[PDB]
C-alpha cells in the first residue's frame, strides 16, 4: 500500500547489486526451470528448411540478493528493471532469426518473490531450422526440434530443467497448421560436451505428418487422367494416322506442361522426391504409348494382322502395367 | 505562460517518481480505458494468414503521482518524457510484427491532466494473425480479431475497458479494402485465466466478405467457355476423326493450362477449395466428352446407328449434366 | 573565430533548457514553416497501393530560448545537438514505412540564428499509401498525396504553413517516373478536427498519368493479331474440317495462354480492369468464330448454300463487329 | 610504451572538446580529402534502377584540438572514440539504403596523428540509384554515379577533394560484374548551389557495357529458328491444307509462348525496348506467313497457277525481307 | 564463494581501464587466436553469388590489465561486461550482411583467466559473398572462402593465428547441404598490404561439389525423350503429311516450353552454361529433324525413291549424331 516503502525496498535490493555475477557465484550452480506456452506456428518452409514459432518463454530461478522481507506480496515490476538484474544467457541452438516483441512495450515480464525467486517471461518469435528429409514428399513425416542452451555458463554454473515435467510446454494442442498435424511432442533434458566444457540442454521436439488430400486432388489426378487419355489412342482406328499422332503428342505436351508447372509451384527442393518419380512414371507411360503407336503404324503396311494384335495387346497391357506401377508406388510410400 | 514555473512543476512531478511501480501499487487495480482510431488496413494475406493494420492506439489512466496544481491547463508534453513515466504493458496477443512509427519523431503523445490523468497515444502498424477457413474460397466470409492484453500485470493490478463503449473504435467505415467489405465490427471485454493468473482482455473483431466479381470474370467464365467448346465436338461429323481428336485434346490442354496458371496466380493454399472443385469438375467434363467421342469412334464401324444415337444423347445430356453441376455448386456455396 | 566563446554561448543556450516544453509554452502557438525538396520517387506500386518518395524535409520555427547575441553569424551545429532541442512532432498521416538516412551520419541538419530561429532538415525516404482507382487501368490517372500533421500538439500549440508559398516544394520537375508523368502538383494547408481537438495539416498532391505505349505494344497488339488469325478461318474452305478445327482451337489456346501470362505479369489487382474487359472481348470473339464454324460444319451437309452464305456473312461481319467493339472501347476509356 | 601517459594525453585531448563545433569554427573551411576502396558491386538492378556497392570510405582532415606532443607515433584508437569526436556530415546524394557493417564490431577506424590529423574509415554497403535508359536493352550502355556531399555545412565551412587525385578511388579493376564490364571510371569535384547555399560535391562515375552473349543465345536464336520454321510451310505442298494450317498456327503459338516467357523472365521494364521490337518483328513475320498461306489457299481453286506463283514469290521474299529486317536492326543498335 | 570479494576484484580490474587502448599499446602486437565452430550453412545462392553461414566465433588474447590474483578460478562474466573491455576489431572481408544473435540475450560470452587471458565468443550469422564460375553448371565445383581481418590495427598492433592449428575450425563434417557436398576445407594465415599498411588475414575455404541426380532426372531426361519423339517421325509413312507436320511442330513446341520453364526455374544466371548448351543442342536436333522432313516432303513428288533414301539415312543418322553429341558433352564436362 505504501509505495515509498516498496520503492525503498527495491532500491535496497538493487543497491550493490552486481549484474556481472550469477547468483551463488563461486558456489553451487543456479537451477533454471523453463516453461513454454506456444501461441502459434506461423509457417513451415521446406525451401528454407525451417519453421516459425511464437511462444511465451518463462524462466524460473532464485537469487538470494533479491530476497525481501516485510512485504507479503509478489512484486510484478516494470519490464525495464530486467536491464538491472542478472538473467540466464539462454539461447536457441538451431534458431536463425529471433526477436522479442516490443509493442506497445517490450514483451517482457519480471516477477519477484520474497524468497528471492525471479520469474522472467518473454514473448519470442523464432525461426528455428529443421532439416527435413523430403524423399517421401508429399507423404513425408518430419521431426522438428527447438534446442535451448546456456551460452557462456557451463554445468558448473547453471543447470536447466523443465519446470512442471511433461506439462512444462503447453498450447501444443491449439497449434493450427494448415498442411501438418502434430502427431506428438517430446521434452528432453541432457548435457552436451564441447571444447569449453559441459552445457545444459533442453529440447522440445514436434512430429509433423503432412496432409495429402491437396496433393491427391491437384497433383496426381491430372496425371492419371492424362495417362488414361494416352491409352485412349489404342481404341482409335489405326487408319487415322493424323488423329492418333495428334492425340499422343498432345498428351505428351500436356504432361510436360503439368510437370513444369508443378515443379514451379512445388517447393524448390533440389533432389529426387516421390511425386517427381510418379510424374516421371506417367511421362514414361505416355512416351511408351506413343512409341507403340509408331511401331504399329510402321508395321501396319507389311502385316496389318500383327499391327492389330499389337494394338489389342497394348489395350490389355497398358492399364495393367499402370495399375501395377500405382500399386507399387502406393505400397512403397505408405 | 511562465515556462520556468511549468518546468519546476514538471520536475517536482518527476522527482522521486518510480517507473518500476504501477499507480496505486499494492492497492486497487489501475483502470486503463483504450480507444482505437483505425487509419487503414494495408493488406489481408491468405498465404501468410494475417492482415496489416495501422491505427492510433490511445490509453487513458490515472496516476496520482502526476497530479499537479496551480496550472489550469492540460500539459501536452514531448513524447520523450514517456520514457520517464509508467505505462501499461499493453501488447497484442495475435500480432506477428508490430512497430511504432518514428518519423519525424516517434509517433507518440503524452498528455497530462491536473487530476493526474495520463493520455498516452501511439501510432502502430501491426500484422495480426488471422486463421482463415478457405474451404468456400473465393465465396468465403472471414472473421479477423485483434486481441489486446496486459503482459505482466494480472486483474489484481490492472483492468481494461473500452473508453467510450461501442464508439471506442472509430474509422472502420473509412477502411478501403479492394477485395473485402467490412460487414460488421464488434468490441469484447473479458478476463482470461492462465497459469500465472487472470489477465484483462479486449477484442476488436471484423467480419469480412470477399468480392466475387473478379473471380467470376477471370476464373469461372474461361472454364465454362472451354467446357462449351468441348461440347462443340458433338455436333461435328464423326467421319472427321482428326478434327474431333484435335478439338477434344486441345480443349483438355487448354483446361490444364488454365488450371495450372490459376493455381500459380491463386494464393498458395495447401488444401481443397471451392474453385479447385469447380476446375476439377470442368476437367472431368471435358475428359468425359473425349472418352465419349472415343467410344463413338470405336463403335462407329460395327454399328453407325448406335454411334449416332450416342452422339445425339451426348448432345442432349452434357449441357444438362453441366447445368445440374453448376446449380448444385452455386446453391451449395451460396 | 574564438571557439571557446562559441562553446560558452552554446552551453548558456542549453543551460536550463527544457526539451519537454514547446517554445512559448502556455502562450501563442509556435508557427512552423515547412519546405520539401524532392530528390526522387523510387517506385509506384499498384499491388501495394503506395509510392516511395525521398525528400529533404526542412522545418523552420522560432525558439526564444535559443536566441544568442554577440555572434553575427548563423550557427550550423552538429546534428547530434538536435537530440538536446525541442523539435515539432511532425509525422506523415498516410505513410507506412519511413526512415531517416544514417550514412555516414544521421542525415540531419540543425542551424541556429541570432533571433532564436531554428532550421531543422532531414532526409526522409517514406512509403506513402495511395489508394488507386484501377478501373481504367492502364489508361488511368491517379492522385497521390503526402499528408503532414502534428501528432500531439493541437492548433492551440502549433501551426503549420508552407514556407515560400507555392514554391515551398521543389524538385517536382526533376522527378523521373518511367511509367508515369506528373501532370500537376498542389499544396494545401488546413485544420482537421479529431476527438482530441483541431490539428494543423499540410498536403502535397501529385497527379500522375500512366504511359500507354508499352501496354499498346505488348498487351493489345497480340490479342488483335490473334483475333485476325481467328477470322482467317472464314476464308479457308469448309471441306477441310480438320484444318479449320485446328486453327480455331489453337487460336483459343493462344488467347488463353496470352491472358494467363498477362494476368501473371500484370499487377495483382483483384477487381475488373479495362484491359481485362478487352481480353475478355477478344476471347469471346474467337469463341464465337469457332462456334460459327461449328454451325457451318453442322449445316453444310443438309444445305451447302446456306453454309456458304453464313461463311461470307461471317467474313463481312466479324471484322465489322470487332471494329465497333474497339471503337466503343477506345472512346469510352479516352 | 607507457599506457598511463597515453591515456592521460588522450583524456587531455578530449577534455573540453566540443563535438558540436567543426574544426576552425568561425574561420577558414576545413578541407576533407576522401578516398574509396571498392570491395565489390553486389548487383545492378534494372527493375529497381539501382546498384549495390560495398566500399571502404576514408575521410582525411585536420583538427588542431586533437594535436598531441610527446608521442612520436600515430594513435590508432578504438572505433567507439569516434562517437566523442567531430566528423564530417558526409552523405550520399543518390543512395536509397546504406549501412555500416557492425560485425564483429562497427566497421570503423579512427587514426590520430601528432599534427591533429584525423583519418576516419568506414565500411559502407550503399544501394545507389541509377537512372538507366533501357531503349537499347540489352545492347545498352549505362552510366551510374555515386554522389558525395556535405549535408549541413556549406562551402564556407567545409571543402571536399579527392585525396590522391585520379588514384583516390581504387579497386575498380577488381570489380567482377557477371553481366557488365566497366569501360571507364571518372572522378569529379565541384560545388552545387541550393537555396541554403553552396555545398561541396564529389562524384564517382562508372560506365558499364552489358554483355550480349546470353541474350544472343537465349533470346534471339529461338525466335530466328521459329521464323525459319514458319518459312518452312512455303515448300510444303498446298494440297495438304491441314498440315500447313497446323504448322503456321503452331509457329504462332510457339512465338506467343516464347514472347510471354521472355517477358516474364526479363526485368519488369514498362516501356519499349530493342528486344521487344525484335520479338514483335518476328511475330509479325510469322503472322504474315500465315496470312499469305491463307490467301494462297483461298485463291488456289480459282487459279492454281497464281497460287503457285505467290507461293514461290513468298519462298524468295520472306527470307530476304527477314534478312533486311535483321540487317537494319543490327546496324541501328550497333 | 564470497561474491563481494569477486565484485571488488572486478571493479579493481575495471578501475582506470581504457577501452580506447589495445593491450600492450605502444609495444609488441597483441596476438589473437581464433577458432570457429560452424553450426550450419543455411543456403548457397547462385543468383546472389553468396552463402549464409552460422558459427560460433571465439577470439583468444591476453590483456595484462585484466590479470587478477587470489581467485583460483576462471571468471565467466555477463556478456554486457564486453561493452567495458577492449575487443579486437575483427571483421569479415567478403561478408554482405552479418549479425549477432540477441535472443534471449546477446549471443556473447566473456571469460577471464587469472593471467589476464580473455576468451570472447560470439554467435554470428554472416552472408559471405562467393564468386561462382557457373560455366560448367550444374556439373560445377565451387570454392567459397570466409576472410577474417583486422579493420584498424596493422600487423604492428595485432597478429592473427588459428588457435589449434588445422583443428581450429570444427563442425565442417556436420554441415548438411542438400545440393552440395563439402570436398575439403582449408585454413590459411597471411598478411595483406594496403595503402594503410600490413594487416593480418585468416582464411577459411570450402570446396563444394554440386549434386547432379536432380538435374539428370528433371532437366536432361525430358529433353532426351523429346528428341527421341522427334526421331519417331522418321518411321512414320511420308504420305501422312499432316501427322508428321503435327508431330514435328509439337515436338518443337514441347522443347520450347521445357526450355522456357527450365530457364524460369533455374537460377537467374546471365551467361552461357552447360545445361543451356545441351538444351540448345536438343532444340537444334528437333529443328533439323523438322527441316529434313520438309525436304523429304518437297522432293517426294519428283523422286519418291530419293525421299525414301533420305528418310532411311535420317533414321540411321539422327540417333548416331545425337549419341556423338551426348558423348562429347559428357566427356567435356566430366
Ligand atoms: C526428433 O529427433 C530427436 C533426435 O534427433 C529425438 O530426441 C531424442 O528423444 C529421445 C526420447 O524420445 C531421447 O532419449 C532419451 O534421452 C534421455 C536423456 O539422455 C541424456 O541424459 C542422460 C542422463 O539424464 C544420459 O545418461 C544420456 O547419455 C544422455 O546424455 C534419457 O534420459 C532417456 O532415457 C530414459 O528412457 C529410455 C527409453 O526411452 C530408457 O531406456 C532409460 O532407462 C531412461 O528411462 C532417453 O534415452 C534422446 O536423447 C533424444 N535425442 C536428442 C539428440 O535429443 C526426438 O524425440 C524426435 N522427436 C520426436 C517427436 O520423437
Ligand atoms: C469472431 O469470432 C470471435 C470468437 O472467436 C467473436 O467473439 C465473440 O463475440 C461474442 C459477442 O458477439 C462474445 O460474447 C459475449 O461475451 C461477453 C464477455 O463474456 C466474458 O465476460 C463475462 C463477464 O463480463 C463472463 O461472464 C463470460 O464468461 C466471459 O468471460 C459477454 O458479456 C456477452 O454476454 C452478453 O450478451 C449475450 C448475448 O450475446 C447475453 O446472453 C448475455 O446475457 C450478455 O448480455 C457475450 O456472451 C464472445 O465472448 C466472443 N468470443 C471471444 C473468444 O472473444 C467475434 O464476435 C467474431 N467476430 C464478429 C464480427 O462477430
Ligand atoms: C488529390 O485529391 C485531393 C483531395 O482528396 C485534392 O486536395 C484538395 O485540393 C483542393 C485544391 O485543389 C482543396 O481545396 C482548397 O482547400 C483550401 C483549404 O480549405 C480548408 O481551410 C479553409 C480555411 O483556410 C476552410 O475554410 C475550409 O473549410 C478547409 O478547412 C481552401 O482554402 C481553398 O479555397 C480557395 O480556393 C477555392 C477554389 O479552389 C475558392 O473557391 C476559395 O474562395 C478559396 O480561394 C480550396 O477550397 C481541397 O481542400 C483539397 N482536399 C483535401 C482533402 O485536401 C488534391 O488537389 C488532388 N490532387 C491534385 C493534383 O489536384
Ligand atoms: C556520367 O554522367 C555524368 C553527368 O551526368 C558525367 O559527369 C560529368 O563528367 C565531366 C567530366 O567527364 C564533368 O566535366 C568536368 O567538370 C569539372 C567540374 O566543373 C565544375 O567546377 C568548375 C570549377 O572547378 C566550374 O567552373 C564548373 O562550372 C563546374 O561547377 C570541370 O573542371 C572540367 O573542366 C575541365 O575539363 C574540360 C574538358 O573536359 C576542360 O574544357 C576544362 O578547361 C577543364 O580542364 C569538366 O568540365 C562534368 O561536370 C560531370 N557532370 C556532372 C553532373 O557531374 C560522368 O563523367 C559520366 N560518366 C562517365 C564514366 O563518363
Ligand atoms: C579457394 O581459393 C583460394 C585462393 O583464392 C585458396 O587459398 C589458397 O590456399 C593455398 C593453400 O592451399 C595458399 O597457399 C599457401 O599460402 C601460405 C601463406 O602464404 C602467405 O604467407 C607466407 C608467410 O607465412 C608468405 O611467404 C606468402 O608470400 C604469403 O603471403 C603459405 O605459407 C603456403 O606455403 C606452404 O605450402 C606450400 C605448398 O602448398 C609450400 O610450397 C611452402 O613451402 C609452404 O610450406 C602456401 O603457399 C594460398 O595462399 C591461398 N590463397 C589465398 C588468396 O588465400 C583456397 O585453398 C581454395 N579452397 C580450397 C578448398 O582449396
Ligand atoms: C511509507 O514509507 C516511507 C519510507 O519508509 C515512510 O517514510 C512513510 O512514513 C511510510 N508511510 C506511512 C503512512 O507510514
Ligand atoms: C575566447 O573565449 C574565452 C571564453 O570567454 C575567453 O576566456 C578567451 O580569452 C577568449 N579568447 C580571446 C583571444 O579573447
Ligand atoms: C607513465 O605515465 C604516468 C602518468 O603520467 C606516470 O605517473 C608514470 O610514472 C609513467 N611511468 C613511468 C615508468 O614513468
Ligand atoms: C567478502 O569480501 C568483502 C570485501 O572484501 C569483505 O568485506 C567480507 O568480509 C568478505 N566475507 C568474508 C566472509 O570474509
Ligand atoms: N493527428 C493527431 C493524432 C490522431 C489522429 N486521429 C486520432 N489521433
Ligand atoms: Cl514485434
Ligand atoms: Cl515508420
Ligand atoms: Cl539509409
Ligand atoms: Cl552487416
Ligand atoms: Cl537473431
Domains in chain C and their CATH numbers? Answer: 3-210 (2.70.170.10), 213-332 (1.20.58.390)
Alpha carbon of E68 to those of A23, B226, E60, E65, E121: distances in Å? Answer: 21, 85, 17, 9, 21
B62: which residues sit within 8 A by CB, 6+ positions away?
B23, B30, B31, B115, B116, B117, B118
- Beta strand A141-150 with D158-162 is unpaired
d(CA B88, CA D12): 46
At residue B24, the 3 state secondary structure works out as coil
Contact D111/E241, CB-based, under 8 Å? Answer: no
In the 8-state DSSP scheme, what is residue C98? Answer: E
Alpha carbon of C24 to those of B113, C60, C114: distances in Å? Answer: 19, 15, 17
**Residue corresponding to grid cell 542452451:** A149
d(CA D90, CA C107): 9
Q: What are phi and psi of B291, to 5 degrees?
A: -65, -40
**Residue corresponding to grid cell 526522409:** C124
Task: Say if CB B153 and CB B197 are below 8 A apart.
Answer: no
d(CA C156, CA B76): 11
Cα separation of the two ends of chain C = 66
Which grid cell sits at D89? Answer: 556530415
d(CA B126, CA B97): 6
Task: Say if CB C264 and CB B261 are below 8 A apart.
Answer: yes
Chain centroid to Cα B134, Å, comes to: 12
d(CA A304, CA A297): 9
Q: Is the CB of B143 under 6 A from ligand 2?
A: yes
Which among D187, D55, D210 has a CA at the least distance from the CA of D125?
D55
Cα separation of the two ends of chain B = 66
- Beta strand D158-162 with D30-45 is parallel
Alpha carbon of C285 to those of A267, C319, C320: distances in Å? Answer: 38, 10, 12
| CB-count burial class (<10 Å; 0-12, 13-18, 19+) for A190 | exposed
Q: Is the CB of E302 under 6 A from ligand 9?
A: no
d(CA C159, CA C152): 12
d(CA C46, CA C208): 13
Cα separation of the two ends of chain A = 66
Which grid cell sits at B292? Answer: 465419349
d(CA D327, CA D281): 13
In angstroms, what is the span from residue C157 Cα to ligand 10's centroid? Answer: 15
Q: Is the CB of E174 under 6 A from ligand 5?
A: no
d(CA B304, CA B258): 35
Task: Say if CB B247 and CB C253 are below 8 A apart.
Answer: no
d(CA E232, CA E318): 11
d(CA E275, CA E259): 10
Task: Say if CB C205 and CB C186 are below 8 A apart.
Answer: yes
Which among C321, C301, C300, C320 has a CA at the least distance from the CA of C309?
C300
In angstroms, what is the span from residue B186 Cα to ligand 12's centroid? Answer: 28
Q: What are phi and psi of E142, to 5 degrees?
A: -110, 160
Which among D49, D97, D43, D94 has a CA at the least distance from the CA of D270?
D49
d(CA A149, CA A147): 7
Alpha carbon of C147 to those of C90, C120, C174, C192, D160: distances in Å? Answer: 10, 19, 21, 11, 37
Task: Say if CB A243 and CB A257 are below 8 A apart.
Answer: no
d(CA B224, CA B216): 11
- Beta strand B141-150 with B75-77 is unpaired
List beta partners, residue D160. Answer: D32
Task: Say if CB D147 and CB D201 are below 8 A apart.
Answer: yes
In angstroms, what is the span from residue B14 Cα to ligand 6's centroid? Answer: 19
- Beta strand E30-45 with E108-112 is unpaired
If one residue of E1, E2, E6 were mutated to test the ligand 9 pocket, choosing by the most ligand atoms within 8 A of its CB, it would be: E2
Task: Say if CB D19 and CB D84 are below 8 A apart.
Answer: yes
Task: Say if CB A130 and CB A102 are below 8 A apart.
Answer: no
d(CA B221, CA C256): 12
How large is the greatest C-alpha to C-alpha distance in chain E, in angstroms?
111
At residue E248, the 3 state secondary structure works out as helix
Question: Which helix H or strand E contains A189, and what residues bound it?
Answer: strand A180-194
Which among C221, C231, C240, C223 has a CA at the least distance from the CA of C289?
C231
Long-range contact set of residues E314-317: C-beta below 8 Å, sequence gap at least 24: E314/E234, E314/E289, E315/E231, E315/E234, E315/E235
Which among C266, C267, C250, C254 has a CA at the least distance from the CA of C223?
C254
Question: Which helix H or strand E contains C186, and what residues bound it?
Answer: strand C180-194
d(CA E186, CA E207): 9
If one residue of C90, C95, C150, C151 were mutated to test the ligand 10 pocket, choosing by the most ligand atoms within 8 A of its CB, it would be: C151
Task: Say if CB A238 and CB A299 are below 8 A apart.
Answer: no
Which among A121, A120, A125 has a CA at the least distance from the CA of A95?
A125
d(CA B245, CA D25): 89
**Residue corresponding to grid cell 520517464:** B84
- Beta strand A30-45 with A169-170 is parallel
Strand residue runs (E) in chain B: 30-45, 50-62, 75-77, 90-92, 95-100, 108-112, 117-129, 141-150, 158-162, 169-170, 180-194, 197-210
d(CA D192, CA D201): 7
d(CA D112, CA A79): 42
Task: Say if CB D192 and CB D128 are below 8 A apart.
Answer: no
A182: which residues sit within 8 A by CB, 6+ positions away?
A172, A175, A206, A207, A208
Find the ligand nearest to C105 CA.
13
CB burial readout E297-314, b (16+ within 10 A) else e: beebeeeeeebeebbeeb
Q: DSSP string spanning B209-225?
A: EE--HHHIIIIIHHHHH
Which grid cell sits at E151? Answer: 579493420
In the 8-state DSSP scheme, what is residue C104? Answer: B
At residue E264, the 3 state secondary structure works out as helix
Q: DSSP string spanning E125-182?
A: EEEEE-----TTTTS-EEEEEEEEEESS--TTTEEEEETTGGGSEE-STT---SSEEE
**Residue corresponding to grid cell 558459427:** E55
| Method by which the coordinates were obtained | cryo-EM
Question: Which helix H or strand E contains C195, and what residues bound it?
Answer: none
Q: Is the CB of C65 under 6 A from ligand 3?
A: no
Which grid cell sits at B77? Answer: 508534453
Chain D nearest CA to E260, separation (Å): 6
CB burial readout C262-273, b (16+ within 10 A) else e: bbeebbebbbbb
SS (H, E, C) A229-251: HHHHCCCCCCCCHHHHHHHHHHH
Which among E113, E316, E134 has a CA at the least distance from the CA of E208?
E134
**Which chain C residue has the Cα nearest residue D194?**
C37
Contacts of A18 in chain E (CB under 8 A): 3, 7, 10
Long-range contact set of residues A229-233: C-beta below 8 Å, sequence gap at least 24: A229/A254, A229/B249, A229/B252, A229/B287, A229/B290, A230/A285, A230/A286, A230/A289, A230/A290, A231/A289, A231/A315, A231/A318, A231/A319, A232/B290, A232/B291, A232/B294, A233/A289, A233/A293
In this complex, which of E3, E37, E253 lies closest to A25 when CB atoms are compared?
A: E3
d(CA C270, CA C49): 12
Task: Say if CB C255 and CB C283 are below 8 A apart.
Answer: yes
E300: which residues sit within 8 A by CB, 6+ positions away?
E238, E307
CB burial readout B34-46, b (16+ within 10 A) else e: bbbbbbbbbbbeb
d(CA C228, CA D287): 9
Alpha carbon of B20 to those of A283, B25, B286: distances in Å? Answer: 70, 10, 72
Which among B158, B64, B159 has a CA at the least distance from the CA of B112?
B64
Q: What are phi and psi of D23, to 5 degrees?
A: -60, 140
At residue B21, the 3 state secondary structure works out as coil
At residue D287, the 3 state secondary structure works out as helix
At residue D171, the 3 state secondary structure works out as coil
d(CA C35, CA C26): 27
d(CA E44, CA A333): 30
d(CA C64, CA C23): 7
Which grid cell sits at C80? Answer: 547530434
Contact residues of ligand 7, CB 6 A cut-off: C 2, 4-5, 8
| CB-count burial class (<10 Å; 0-12, 13-18, 19+) for A259 | buried
Contacts of B250 in chain A (CB under 8 A): 250
Which among D156, E201, B228, A119 has a CA at the least distance from the CA of C286?
B228
Which grid cell sits at E46? Answer: 547462385
Q: DSSP string spanning A26-79?
A: TSSPEEEEEEEEEEEEEEEETTTTEEEEEEEEEEEEE-GGG---S--S-EEE-G
d(CA A282, CA A325): 10
d(CA C209, CA D17): 55
What ranges in chain D are assigned the alpha helix state H?
Answer: 3-14, 213-215, 221-232, 241-265, 274-300, 304-332
Contacts of E179 in chain A (CB under 8 A): 270-271
d(CA D236, CA E299): 10
Amino acid at each position: 500500500g505504501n509505495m515509498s516503502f516498496v520503492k525503498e525496498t527495491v532500491d535496497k535490493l538493487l543497491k550493490g547489486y552486481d549484474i556481472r555475477l550469477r547468483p551463488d557465484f563461486g558456489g553451487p550452480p543456479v537451477c533454471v526451470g523453463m516453461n513454454i506456452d506456444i501461441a502459434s506456428i506461423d509457417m513451415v518452409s521446406e525451401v528454407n528448411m525451417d519453421y516459425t514459432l511464437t511462444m511465451y518463454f518463462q524462466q524460473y530461478w532464485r537469487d538470494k540478493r533479491l530476497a525481501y522481507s516485510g512485504i507479503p506480496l509478489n512484486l510484478t515490476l516494470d519490464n525495464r528493471v530486467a536491464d538491472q538484474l542478472w538473467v540466464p544467457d539462454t539461447y536457441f541452438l538451431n534458431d536463425k532469426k529471433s526477436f522479442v516483441h516490443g509493442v506497445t512495450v517490450k514483451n517482457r515480464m519480471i516477477r519477484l518473490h520474497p524468497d528471492g525467486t525471479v520469474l522472467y517471461g518473454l514473448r519470442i518469435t523464432t525461426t528455428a531450422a529443421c532439416m527435413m528429409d523430403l524423399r517421401r514428399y508429399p507423404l513425408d513425416e518430419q521431426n522438428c526440434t527447438l534446442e535451448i542452451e546456456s551460452y557462456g555458463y557451463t554445468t558448473d554454473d547453471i543447470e536447466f530443467y523443465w519446470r512442471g515435467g511433461d506439462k512444462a510446454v503447453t498450447g501444443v494442442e491449439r497449434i493450427e497448421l494448415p498442411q501438418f498435424s502434430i502427431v506428438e511432442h517430446r521434452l528432453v533434458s541432457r548435457n552436451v560436451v564441447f571444447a569449453t566444457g559441459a552445457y545444459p540442454r533442453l529440447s522440445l521436439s514436434f512430429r509433423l505428418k503432412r496432409n495429402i488430400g491437396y496433393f491427391i486432388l491437384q497433383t496426381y489426378m491430372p496425371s492419371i487422367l492424362i495417362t488414361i487419355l494416352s491409352w485412349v489412342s489404342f481404341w482409335i482406328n489405326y487408319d487415322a494416322s493424323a488423329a492418333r499422332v495428334a492425340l499422343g503428342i498432345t498428351t505428351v505436351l500436356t504432361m510436360t506442361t503439368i510437370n513444369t508447372h508443378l515443379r514451379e509451384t512445388l517447393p524448390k527442393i533440389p533432389y529426387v522426391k516421390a511425386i517427381d518419380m510418379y510424374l516421371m512414371g506417367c511421362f514414361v507411360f505416355v512416351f511408351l504409348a506413343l512409341l507403340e503407336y509408331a511401331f504399329v503404324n510402321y508395321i501396319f503396311f507389311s502385316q496389318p494382322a500383327r499391327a492389330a494384335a499389337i494394338d489389342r495387346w497394348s489395350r490389355i497391357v497398358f492399364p495393367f502395367t499402370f495399375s501395377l506401377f500405382n500399386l507399387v508406388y502406393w505400397l512403397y510410400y505408405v
